[PDB]
């Protein structure tokens, strides 16, 4: 059936330039307009532009006129997006879509582009011990700062998964070129610090597997 | 030249409910309007095009209407899988801009966040860095505003915020805010407060810890 395959995620450094692929199967790209749409982490869909593969006629959103360049090669049934002079502002998912005026509307799974200088860094996992007002209440919330790592992802389990519920592992945010995420766990005031609560965070890239017992701070 | 103003940005609803999302083009788009649904971690999918013609596999519960500049998408009996974002795009002229999007979330009662602040771990101080964290867990609606302060002085830079999406089993939200200071600065001040302003309280829920009061 129709399928628009986009390159895998892409890693590139500020100032560099990337070219994302979007290949179409089950239909000839020139029967429609190939679009490229950007979607910043947790933000709207911004249409970058389109390329009428038939005519080579490209149209863009003024904001991307100089930053973007869409091209195509009906041969390989592929369209492309050439982003120039990367900025941290270009970190977003880049969707290509084949469509025009009717019901023929197909989208690609998306390519996530991340603008970062960082090299494959292990995270610094820091056990987050509480700010006590929560102590004299039913449950205590502990957490882990999995900081300054690269690249995503990281699986954060607690007590080796024994602690499955009450956990909130937060999405990572790329700041100053490196990832930082924090996860939280709520356990009864009975379980901690009386019993052990350790956060296990695994970072496959750097191959780091690190456990960290949340020891009450010097309070 | 033409921009779509989608409304509302967020809309809370429940199964069985009817809902209408709107998009107003900054100019006449002649019904060259399409509506897209984007579910979590998925690529947009067309629901309606030409203002009112339902796309393939889009059930009858979705209707589309409008003319000229004002357009609407109505979902009649909200099934559980209709929850997602909705974008309208005009294809009247270049650029084929999108509306800002409408997130349709599961309505549930308000819940104030469970806030928790965490001073910097001794291990981080050892590296000359210092991050104070604040978890604002299980709250609803998602409109919340965190504000950091270091000795009563607001601190805007250094803050790193993140959000989970509406929980599957209880539909609440969660946020985590991190202030990243240097040790030099950190050990030069005493009060770190995290201020959360949410719909459930008129005054900010605040959490503080003093660096040398421990």
Coordinates of C-alpha atoms in Angstrom, one line a residue:
Chain A
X1 CA 0.0 0.0 0.0
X2 CA 1.3 3.6 -0.1
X3 CA 4.4 4.3 2.1
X4 CA 6.6 7.3 2.5
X5 CA 9.8 6.3 4.2
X6 CA 11.9 9.0 5.7
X7 CA 15.6 8.6 6.8
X8 CA 16.2 7.7 10.4
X9 CA 16.8 10.4 12.9
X10 CA 19.7 12.7 12.1
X11 CA 22.5 14.1 14.2
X12 CA 24.4 17.2 13.0
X13 CA 26.4 20.1 14.5
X14 CA 25.4 23.8 14.6
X15 CA 26.4 25.5 11.3
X16 CA 26.4 22.2 9.4
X17 CA 23.8 21.3 6.8
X18 CA 21.6 18.2 6.4
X19 CA 19.6 16.5 3.6
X20 CA 16.7 14.4 4.7
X21 CA 15.2 11.8 2.4
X22 CA 11.6 10.9 1.9
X23 CA 11.0 8.0 -0.5
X24 CA 7.5 7.0 -1.7
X25 CA 6.3 3.5 -2.6
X26 CA 2.9 2.7 -3.9
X27 CA 2.5 5.9 -5.8
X28 CA 4.5 8.2 -8.1
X29 CA 5.6 11.3 -6.3
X30 CA 4.7 13.5 -9.3
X31 CA 1.0 12.7 -9.0
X32 CA 1.0 15.0 -5.9
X33 CA 2.9 17.8 -4.1
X34 CA 5.6 16.6 -1.7
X35 CA 5.6 18.7 1.4
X36 CA 8.0 19.1 4.2
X37 CA 6.6 20.1 7.5
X38 CA 8.6 20.9 10.7
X39 CA 7.3 20.1 14.2
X40 CA 9.3 21.4 17.0
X41 CA 9.4 19.3 20.2
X42 CA 5.9 19.9 21.7
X43 CA 4.9 22.6 19.2
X44 CA 2.8 23.1 16.2
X45 CA 3.2 21.8 12.6
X46 CA 5.0 24.5 10.5
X47 CA 4.8 24.0 6.8
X48 CA 8.3 24.6 5.3
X49 CA 7.4 24.2 1.7
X50 CA 6.5 21.9 -1.1
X51 CA 8.0 20.7 -4.4
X52 CA 5.7 19.8 -7.3
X53 CA 7.9 16.9 -8.5
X54 CA 6.4 17.3 -11.9
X55 CA 7.5 20.8 -12.5
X56 CA 10.3 21.3 -10.0
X57 CA 8.1 24.2 -8.8
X58 CA 9.0 24.8 -5.1
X59 CA 7.1 27.2 -2.9
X60 CA 8.3 28.0 0.7
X61 CA 7.2 29.8 3.8
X62 CA 9.2 33.0 3.8
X63 CA 10.7 32.1 7.2
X64 CA 12.4 29.2 5.6
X65 CA 13.3 30.7 2.2
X66 CA 17.0 30.9 3.0
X67 CA 17.1 28.2 5.7
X68 CA 15.5 25.5 3.5
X69 CA 15.7 24.0 0.1
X70 CA 13.4 21.3 -1.1
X71 CA 14.3 19.3 -4.2
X72 CA 13.2 16.0 -5.8
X73 CA 14.4 13.2 -8.1
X74 CA 11.3 11.6 -9.6
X75 CA 13.7 8.9 -10.6
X76 CA 14.1 7.4 -7.1
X77 CA 10.6 8.7 -6.3
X78 CA 12.3 10.8 -3.5
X79 CA 11.9 14.3 -2.3
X80 CA 14.5 16.1 -0.1
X81 CA 14.9 18.8 2.4
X82 CA 18.2 20.6 2.6
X83 CA 18.6 22.6 5.8
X84 CA 21.6 25.0 5.8
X85 CA 23.5 26.6 8.7
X86 CA 21.9 24.6 11.5
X87 CA 20.8 26.3 14.7
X88 CA 19.3 24.7 17.8
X89 CA 16.0 26.1 16.3
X90 CA 16.2 23.4 13.6
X91 CA 15.9 20.6 16.1
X92 CA 12.5 19.2 15.4
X93 CA 10.7 16.3 13.7
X94 CA 10.7 16.8 9.9
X95 CA 7.7 15.2 8.2
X96 CA 7.4 14.8 4.5
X97 CA 3.9 14.3 3.1
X98 CA 2.5 13.5 -0.3
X99 CA -0.7 15.3 -1.0
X100 CA -2.3 18.2 -2.8
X101 CA -6.0 19.0 -3.1
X102 CA -7.9 15.8 -2.5
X103 CA -8.1 12.7 -0.4
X104 CA -4.8 11.3 -1.5
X105 CA -3.0 12.3 1.7
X106 CA -0.1 10.2 3.0
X107 CA 2.6 11.1 5.6
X108 CA 6.0 9.7 6.5
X109 CA 6.8 8.4 9.9
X110 CA 8.9 11.5 10.4
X111 CA 12.6 12.1 10.8
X112 CA 13.8 13.7 14.1
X113 CA 16.6 16.1 13.6
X114 CA 18.8 17.2 16.5
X115 CA 21.4 20.0 16.2
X116 CA 24.2 19.1 18.7
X117 CA 27.9 19.4 19.1
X118 CA 28.0 16.9 21.9
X119 CA 29.7 13.5 21.5
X120 CA 28.3 10.3 22.9
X121 CA 28.4 11.3 26.6
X122 CA 27.2 9.1 29.5
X123 CA 24.8 11.0 31.8
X124 CA 25.7 12.1 35.2
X125 CA 23.0 10.5 37.3
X126 CA 22.3 12.3 40.5
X127 CA 20.0 10.9 43.2
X128 CA 17.5 13.4 44.1
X129 CA 16.7 13.4 47.8
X130 CA 13.8 15.6 49.0
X131 CA 12.9 19.0 50.4
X132 CA 11.4 17.7 53.6
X133 CA 7.8 19.2 53.9
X134 CA 6.6 16.1 52.0
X135 CA 8.1 13.9 54.7
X136 CA 5.4 14.5 57.3
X137 CA 2.7 13.5 54.7
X138 CA 1.5 10.1 53.4
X139 CA 3.9 9.7 50.5
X140 CA 7.5 10.8 49.7
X141 CA 8.7 11.7 46.2
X142 CA 12.3 11.0 45.2
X143 CA 13.8 11.4 41.8
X144 CA 16.9 11.2 39.6
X145 CA 18.6 13.8 37.5
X146 CA 20.0 12.0 34.5
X147 CA 22.1 14.9 33.3
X148 CA 24.4 16.1 30.5
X149 CA 24.2 12.9 28.4
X150 CA 23.9 12.2 24.7
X151 CA 22.3 10.9 22.7
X152 CA 18.8 9.8 23.7
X153 CA 17.4 7.6 25.1
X154 CA 17.7 6.4 28.6
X155 CA 15.5 3.9 30.5
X156 CA 15.0 4.8 34.1
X157 CA 13.5 2.1 36.2
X158 CA 13.4 2.0 40.0
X159 CA 14.4 -0.8 42.3
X160 CA 15.1 -2.6 39.1
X161 CA 11.5 -2.3 38.0
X162 CA 10.2 -3.6 41.2
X163 CA 8.9 0.0 41.5
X164 CA 6.7 0.1 38.5
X165 CA 3.9 2.4 39.5
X166 CA 3.9 5.9 40.9
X167 CA 6.8 6.8 38.5
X168 CA 6.9 9.8 36.3
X169 CA 9.9 9.7 33.9
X170 CA 9.9 13.1 32.3
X171 CA 10.8 13.7 28.6
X172 CA 14.4 14.8 27.9
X173 CA 15.1 18.4 27.0
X174 CA 18.2 19.2 24.9
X175 CA 19.9 22.2 26.6
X176 CA 23.3 23.7 25.7
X177 CA 23.8 20.7 23.4
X178 CA 23.2 17.9 25.9
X179 CA 20.2 16.0 27.2
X180 CA 18.9 16.1 30.7
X181 CA 15.9 14.2 32.0
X182 CA 14.6 13.6 35.5
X183 CA 12.3 10.8 36.7
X184 CA 10.3 10.7 39.9
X185 CA 9.0 7.9 42.1
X186 CA 6.4 8.2 44.8
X187 CA 6.6 5.6 47.6
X188 CA 4.9 5.6 51.0
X189 CA 6.7 7.4 53.7
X190 CA 7.0 3.8 55.1
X191 CA 9.3 2.5 52.3
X192 CA 11.9 5.3 52.2
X193 CA 14.3 5.9 53.7
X194 CA 13.5 2.8 55.8
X195 CA 13.8 0.6 52.8
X196 CA 16.0 1.0 49.8
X197 CA 14.9 3.0 46.8
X198 CA 17.5 3.2 44.0
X199 CA 17.1 4.5 40.5
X200 CA 18.7 2.5 37.7
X201 CA 19.3 4.4 34.6
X202 CA 20.7 2.7 31.5
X203 CA 22.2 4.7 28.6
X204 CA 22.8 2.2 25.7
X205 CA 24.9 4.5 23.6
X206 CA 27.7 5.1 26.1
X207 CA 27.0 1.7 27.4
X208 CA 26.6 3.1 30.9
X209 CA 24.3 1.3 33.3
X210 CA 24.2 3.1 36.6
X211 CA 22.4 2.5 39.9
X212 CA 22.0 5.2 42.5
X213 CA 20.5 4.7 45.9
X214 CA 18.6 7.8 47.0
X215 CA 20.2 8.4 50.4
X216 CA 18.6 11.2 52.5
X217 CA 20.7 14.3 52.2
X218 CA 22.3 15.8 55.2
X219 CA 18.7 16.5 56.2
Chain B
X1 CA 0.3 35.9 3.3
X2 CA -2.6 34.0 4.8
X3 CA -2.5 32.7 8.3
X4 CA -4.9 30.3 10.0
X5 CA -6.0 31.1 13.5
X6 CA -7.0 27.9 15.0
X7 CA -9.2 27.9 18.2
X8 CA -9.2 26.6 20.8
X9 CA -5.5 25.7 21.5
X10 CA -6.6 23.0 23.9
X11 CA -10.0 21.5 24.4
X12 CA -10.9 19.0 27.2
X13 CA -13.7 16.5 26.4
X14 CA -15.1 13.1 27.3
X15 CA -16.3 10.0 25.4
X16 CA -19.7 10.5 23.9
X17 CA -19.2 14.2 23.7
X18 CA -19.6 16.4 20.6
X19 CA -16.9 18.9 19.9
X20 CA -16.1 21.6 17.3
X21 CA -12.7 23.0 16.6
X22 CA -12.3 26.2 14.5
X23 CA -9.8 27.8 12.1
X24 CA -10.1 31.3 10.7
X25 CA -8.0 32.2 7.7
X26 CA -6.6 35.7 7.7
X27 CA -8.1 36.0 4.3
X28 CA -10.7 34.1 2.2
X29 CA -9.5 30.6 1.5
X30 CA -12.5 29.4 -0.6
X31 CA -12.9 26.2 1.3
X32 CA -9.4 25.1 0.4
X33 CA -9.1 23.9 4.0
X34 CA -8.0 20.6 5.4
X35 CA -8.2 19.2 8.9
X36 CA -5.5 16.9 10.3
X37 CA -5.5 14.7 13.4
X38 CA -2.2 13.8 15.0
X39 CA -2.2 11.2 17.6
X40 CA 0.6 10.7 20.1
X41 CA 3.9 10.0 18.4
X42 CA 2.2 9.6 15.1
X43 CA 2.3 11.4 11.7
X44 CA -0.7 13.6 10.9
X45 CA -3.6 11.9 9.2
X46 CA -6.2 13.7 7.1
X47 CA -9.7 13.7 8.4
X48 CA -11.3 16.2 6.2
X49 CA -10.4 18.2 3.1
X50 CA -12.2 20.8 1.1
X51 CA -13.8 22.0 4.3
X52 CA -16.4 19.2 4.4
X53 CA -15.4 16.1 2.5
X54 CA -14.4 13.3 4.9
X55 CA -11.2 11.4 4.0
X56 CA -10.8 7.7 3.7
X57 CA -11.5 5.7 6.8
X58 CA -12.7 8.7 8.7
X59 CA -15.9 7.7 10.4
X60 CA -19.1 9.6 10.0
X61 CA -18.8 11.1 13.5
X62 CA -16.5 13.8 12.0
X63 CA -18.2 16.6 10.1
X64 CA -16.5 19.7 8.6
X65 CA -18.1 23.0 7.8
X66 CA -17.2 26.6 6.9
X67 CA -17.0 29.1 4.1
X68 CA -14.6 31.9 3.2
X69 CA -12.6 32.5 6.4
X70 CA -14.3 30.7 9.2
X71 CA -14.1 26.8 9.3
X72 CA -15.0 24.2 11.8
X73 CA -14.5 20.5 12.5
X74 CA -17.1 18.8 14.6
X75 CA -16.7 15.3 16.1
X76 CA -20.0 13.9 17.2
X77 CA -19.6 11.0 19.5
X78 CA -16.1 11.3 20.8
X79 CA -14.7 7.7 20.9
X80 CA -11.6 7.1 23.0
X81 CA -9.4 7.2 19.9
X82 CA -10.3 10.6 18.8
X83 CA -8.1 12.2 21.4
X84 CA -5.1 13.9 19.8
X85 CA -4.2 17.2 18.2
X86 CA -6.1 18.7 15.4
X87 CA -4.5 21.1 12.8
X88 CA -6.2 22.8 9.9
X89 CA -4.1 23.8 7.0
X90 CA -5.2 26.1 4.2
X91 CA -4.1 25.2 0.8
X92 CA -5.4 28.4 -0.8
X93 CA -2.1 30.0 -1.5
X94 CA 1.6 29.8 -0.6
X95 CA 2.4 29.4 2.1
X96 CA 0.0 26.6 3.0
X97 CA 0.2 27.5 6.7
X98 CA -1.2 25.4 9.5
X99 CA -3.4 26.5 12.4
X100 CA -1.6 26.4 15.7
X101 CA -3.2 23.2 16.6
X102 CA -5.9 22.1 19.1
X103 CA -5.1 19.4 21.7
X104 CA -8.2 17.4 22.6
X105 CA -7.6 15.9 26.1
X106 CA -9.6 13.7 28.4
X107 CA -11.6 15.9 30.8
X108 CA -11.1 15.0 34.4
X109 CA -11.5 17.0 37.6
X110 CA -8.9 19.6 38.6
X111 CA -6.0 18.2 40.6
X112 CA -3.4 20.5 42.1
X113 CA 0.2 19.4 41.6
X114 CA 2.2 17.6 44.2
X115 CA 5.3 19.9 44.2
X116 CA 8.7 18.7 45.4
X117 CA 12.0 20.5 45.3
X118 CA 15.4 18.8 45.5
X119 CA 18.6 20.6 46.4
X120 CA 21.7 19.7 44.4
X121 CA 23.2 16.4 45.2
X122 CA 26.7 16.5 46.8
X123 CA 27.9 14.6 43.9
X124 CA 27.0 17.4 41.5
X125 CA 28.5 20.2 43.7
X126 CA 31.7 18.2 43.4
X127 CA 31.7 18.9 39.7
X128 CA 31.2 22.7 40.2
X129 CA 27.6 22.5 39.0
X130 CA 24.4 22.7 40.9
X131 CA 20.9 22.0 39.8
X132 CA 17.8 22.5 42.0
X133 CA 14.9 20.4 40.8
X134 CA 11.2 20.8 41.3
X135 CA 8.7 18.1 40.3
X136 CA 5.1 19.3 39.9
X137 CA 3.3 15.9 39.7
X138 CA -0.3 14.7 38.8
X139 CA -2.1 18.0 38.2
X140 CA -4.9 19.1 35.9
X141 CA -5.5 21.2 33.8
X142 CA -2.0 21.4 32.3
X143 CA -1.8 25.2 32.5
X144 CA 0.9 25.8 35.1
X145 CA 3.6 28.3 35.6
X146 CA 6.7 27.7 37.5
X147 CA 8.9 30.5 38.7
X148 CA 12.3 30.1 40.3
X149 CA 13.8 32.5 42.9
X150 CA 17.2 32.7 44.5
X151 CA 16.9 34.9 47.6
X152 CA 13.6 36.4 46.5
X153 CA 15.1 37.3 43.2
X154 CA 13.4 35.8 40.2
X155 CA 15.7 33.7 38.0
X156 CA 14.7 33.2 34.4
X157 CA 17.7 31.6 32.7
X158 CA 19.0 28.2 33.7
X159 CA 15.5 26.8 34.0
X160 CA 14.9 23.6 32.1
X161 CA 11.2 22.4 32.0
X162 CA 9.7 19.2 30.8
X163 CA 6.2 17.7 30.7
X164 CA 4.7 14.2 30.4
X165 CA 1.6 13.9 28.3
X166 CA -1.7 13.3 30.0
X167 CA -1.4 10.0 32.0
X168 CA -3.2 7.0 30.6
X169 CA -4.7 5.7 33.9
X170 CA -5.7 9.0 35.6
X171 CA -5.4 11.7 32.9
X172 CA -3.4 14.1 35.0
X173 CA -0.3 16.0 33.9
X174 CA 3.2 16.3 35.4
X175 CA 6.0 18.7 35.0
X176 CA 9.6 18.8 36.1
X177 CA 11.6 22.1 36.3
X178 CA 15.4 22.3 36.8
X179 CA 17.4 25.5 37.6
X180 CA 21.0 25.0 36.6
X181 CA 23.4 27.2 38.5
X182 CA 27.1 27.0 38.9
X183 CA 28.5 26.0 42.2
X184 CA 30.0 29.4 42.6
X185 CA 26.6 31.0 42.4
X186 CA 24.8 28.3 44.3
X187 CA 27.1 28.5 47.4
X188 CA 26.8 32.3 47.3
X189 CA 23.0 32.2 48.0
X190 CA 20.7 30.5 50.5
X191 CA 17.1 30.4 49.4
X192 CA 15.9 28.5 46.5
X193 CA 12.2 28.5 46.0
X194 CA 10.2 27.0 43.2
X195 CA 6.8 28.7 42.7
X196 CA 4.0 27.0 40.9
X197 CA 0.9 28.9 39.8
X198 CA -1.9 26.7 38.7
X199 CA -5.7 26.9 38.3
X200 CA -6.4 25.1 41.6
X201 CA -5.0 27.8 43.9
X202 CA -5.1 31.5 43.6
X203 CA -1.8 31.9 45.4
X204 CA 1.4 29.9 44.2
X205 CA 2.2 26.6 45.7
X206 CA 5.7 27.2 46.8
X207 CA 8.6 25.0 47.9
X208 CA 11.9 26.1 49.3
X209 CA 15.0 24.8 50.9
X210 CA 17.8 26.9 52.3
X211 CA 21.3 25.9 51.3
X212 CA 22.9 26.3 54.6
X213 CA 19.9 25.6 56.7
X214 CA 20.4 21.9 56.9

